[PDB]
Amino acid sequence: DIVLTQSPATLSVTPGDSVSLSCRASQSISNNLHWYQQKSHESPRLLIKYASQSISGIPSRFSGSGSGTDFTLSINSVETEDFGMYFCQQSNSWPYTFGGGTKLEIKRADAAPTVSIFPPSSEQLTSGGASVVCFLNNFYPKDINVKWKIDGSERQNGVLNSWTDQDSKDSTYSMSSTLTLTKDEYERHNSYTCEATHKTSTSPIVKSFNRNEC
Amino acid sequence: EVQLQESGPSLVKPSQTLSLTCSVTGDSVTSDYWSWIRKFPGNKLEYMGYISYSGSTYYHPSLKSRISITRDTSKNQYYLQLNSVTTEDTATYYCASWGGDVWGAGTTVTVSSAKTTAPSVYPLAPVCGDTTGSSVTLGCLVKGYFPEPVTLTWNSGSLSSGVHTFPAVLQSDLYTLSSSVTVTSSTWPSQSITCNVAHPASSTKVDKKI
Amino acid sequence: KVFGRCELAAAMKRHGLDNYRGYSLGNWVCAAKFESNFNTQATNRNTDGSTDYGILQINSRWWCNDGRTPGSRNLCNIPCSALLSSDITASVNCAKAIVSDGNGMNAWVAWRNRCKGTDVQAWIRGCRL
Predict the structure, then answer these.
(1) Which of A48, A75, A108 is the last residue of a domain?
(2) How far apart are CA A38 and CA A89, in angstroms?
């Protein structure tokens, strides 16, 4: 019932910076708000209980404040091990509810994605299927738009995307976009295009091929 | 010294019952209140309910009534029962102390009617064998398998740098995943590059040369 | 420390007891009055070797550990000594755990007998809250 709204949805910072995460309740919950950390799917860890109470064993850089409907989780001088998800949970009323969470990510220099497109393999075609794959690797920030175009028409049906977690090696992001059609659909068209729109350039990166050929 | 651990089947068919066990060690199952929390694929968290000292239980209204939380003092464990599940009950389930100070590692429970299915592995190579520049990206598409997971390597592990293996996604009840590998244009095609895909659940392992 | 009535009400409000799981502040102030007369250092020895501690007289058999009570459960995972502070933090945290059981505030006998469904609001009105 009680709705907890967290913001910002995502925050990108450099180790050493200090941050403040917000959690707002739709109803007053006095001090019955708790903060959790979770680096992935990995088990959540209680950081602050009852809005501002410290928990023995939790780093001093973590602190909480607020009361009623407005709460804040503060991390002074974020450490490299602090990146991950942060959630607030209220225990004032049953059912207990969690906020949508805020993702703390690592900030780095912007980087354009390296885009590659691949036609359906002869093996998949022999089986009656036809997947067109597009890889967009090592880019930053994470926000990006991928648009597929068949014979000049934007195509949304049959497109499935997958994003990797921020890269442990260089803090970039990578993504795969796959357009799956039947063999008959695929052979009914000629031009296939993967268009990527990213902060790095005002003009989309366009990769494509024509079925008959090259 | 309190520690929790969830255990139970990882797969439940639609309409059937999901059952999980949380083993408590370090202290008795009656020295605290005990809860069940789940995390959906989208990362959202749901507090399913808890059982307190008196044996009284509190269940999330959204679960209607499909949910039951019980405990066994002799084994020092407590359980979760969720009836008539649907695909939407797919999530990571955690048991935790009501105080929130202790959590299990969590266990994934997938709801699907799919049968074990080995993946089809397809090579991803540039259109018409091309090659522009000093580097080339190749790939491997692993499609139509169930259940997760699969392990993918390139050249049996001898080609490990410049690799991006993406999280699997569901496509008509079956999983699909892809991996790309980038090498110098002087490396391929002069040297062979092969995708190796193993799917434990189906006892399969296939190689696909690019 | 012996809290003044209004002083305790404001403190309990700050510690989030007003409307905690549906219990208005009045219930808690009333409970405290009848349990310990607002005295944080109140202690009561029971026949079973257990002792009640603090402003809300919490039991050492079930709720806190004093290192000398047989069959201790320590449900609040806290030293009973923490329940005797001038700082009510610990007592509130434990009271919240206690009231979170199906028994609710019925856990406190004095509450049921002299507070349970009466005009508990009478304990808070008049104050600066």
Answers:
(1) A108
(2) 13
